[PDB]
């Protein structure tokens, strides 16, 4: 079927300056009757998809003109002359000129910022949650930036991949950081078969990886 | 004015049936356009699931097999999905929508198997070696159901320096955990709890963050 591919994925922009997306189709999307039916959409944090543009170039009813469509045939380009704060979200690009509808994966608005490490926190299971024979070892990998960031966990020095789960936040709302938790999940008999527990985080700021760690045994 | 409107159950088990209602007002279903169901799934993507058009007649997606039907009730003015022998991967917010860029609020429908339950909540704290005037506490909410919670800290005065990471799924039961960022003047030196709250169990603990 006909698929909607969107560039970028995440569009850092900055309140007042000028932004522009992607879309890319796998199919012509001119109909029989002429008409080529691409839309853009946009949702805001919270609430539904809201129409944007609805044949190529043509603005909604209900939005500001700073909003532009562009393009024809497979290749087609969302223009926005000034971001504003109500315009952070997602952004989809929409086909309805082939069956079934298709929309595009969605690319991401987020506000630009100087790059961030982060503050990396190691927690050992509570003894509340040994009682109950089990142990989490949680790591915070706290307020960074950009969102892209890798954790690594070793039990005795020794790489941790199973029983790891873990959670980006969304941007935040007042210094545009993210933050991202690790969760080694264990039960008590296997957690206590060991004695050192260390979170590994790695970040485009360093290429040093920002190491934290404790031992059972103190 | 048009205005649409889902209703219906937000959780369906495993093996039964997804019923939603679209309660569609200012403009008449019988006069009209297509009449859409779209979904979207935790990974933000949307799908096209299907509509019902004006004069009764519909499409469905052919992803969804022959285990969707959208009836209509001209009479209210409504048109209703229904999705058979549903999944974890039905899990979704549904739309309701016409054609000309309308759409509904969009309810959260999960599916699982699991009753509801209220979280345990542990303390996080450190253990030996905190650097400078701050620190980062915290309080691991696990295995609950049905979403959501609500946490906070110091009966919500505690603001300034406050995450709560997104929940995840963990055999058939949430978890997340709230992280809280202090000076240590502040800690252990006065008190620091955090309260989380489960309204689908009237759950209220708090739990004090101790040191060692």
């Known amino acids: 079927d006909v698929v909607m591919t969107q560039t970028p994925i995440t569009l850092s922009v900055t309140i007042g300056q000028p932004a522009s997306i992607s879309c890319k189709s796998s199919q012509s999307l001119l109909d029989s009757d002429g008409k080529t039916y691409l839309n853009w959409l946009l949702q805001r944090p919270g609430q539904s998809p809201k129409r944007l543009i609805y044949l190529v170039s043509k603005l909604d009813s209900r939005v500001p003109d700073r909003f532009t469509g562009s393009g024809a045939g497979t290749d087609f380009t969302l223009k926005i002359s000034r971001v504003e704060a109500e315009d952070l979200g997602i952004y989809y690009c929409?086909?309805?000129?082939?069956?079934?509808?298709?929309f595009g994966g969605g690319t991401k608005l987020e506000i630009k910022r100087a790059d961030a490490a982060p503050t990396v926190s190691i927690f050992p299971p509570s003894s509340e949650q040994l009682t109950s024979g089990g142990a989490s070892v949680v790591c915070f990998l706290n307020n960074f930036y950009p969102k892209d960031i890798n954790v690594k966990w070793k039990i005795d020095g020794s790489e941790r991949q199973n029983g790891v789960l873990n959670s980006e936040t969304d941007q935040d709302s007042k210094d545009s950081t993210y933050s991202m938790s690790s969760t080694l999940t264990l039960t008590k008999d296997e957690y206590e078969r060991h004695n050192t527990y260390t979170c590994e985080a790695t970040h485009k700021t360093s290429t040093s990886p920002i190491v934290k760690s404790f031992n059972r045994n103190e | 004015d048009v205005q649409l409107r889902e209703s219906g159950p937000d959780l369906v088990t495993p093996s039964q049936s997804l019923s939603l209602t679209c309660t569609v007002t200012g403009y008449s279903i019988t006069s009209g356009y297509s009449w859409h169901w779209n979904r979207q799934f935790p990974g933000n993507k949307l799908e096209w699931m299907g509509y019902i058009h004006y004069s009764g007649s519909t499409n469905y997606n052919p992803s969804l097999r022959g285990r969707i039907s959208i009836t209509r009730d001209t009479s209210k003015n409504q048109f209703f999905l229904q999705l058979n022998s549903v999944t974890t991967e039905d899990t979704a917010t549904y739309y309701c929508?016409?054609?000309?860029?309308?759409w509904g609020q969009g309810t959260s429908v999960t599916v699982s198997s699991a009753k509801t339950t209220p979280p345990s909540v542990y303390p996080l704290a450190p253990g030996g070696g905190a650097t400078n005037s701050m620190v980062t506490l915290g309080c691991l909410v696990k295995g609950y159901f049905p979403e959501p919670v609500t946490v906070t800290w110091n009966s919500g005065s505690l603001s300034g320096g406050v995450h709560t990471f997104p929940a995840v799924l963990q055999s058939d039961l949430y978890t997340l955990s709230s992280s809280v960022t202090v000076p240590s003047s502040t800690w252990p030196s006065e008190t620091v709890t955090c309260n989380v709250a489960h309204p689908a169990s009237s759950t209220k603990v708090d739990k004090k963050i101790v040191p060692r």
């Open positions: 929409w086909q309805g000129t082939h069956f079934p509808q298709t």
């Open positions: 929508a016409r054609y000309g860029g309308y």
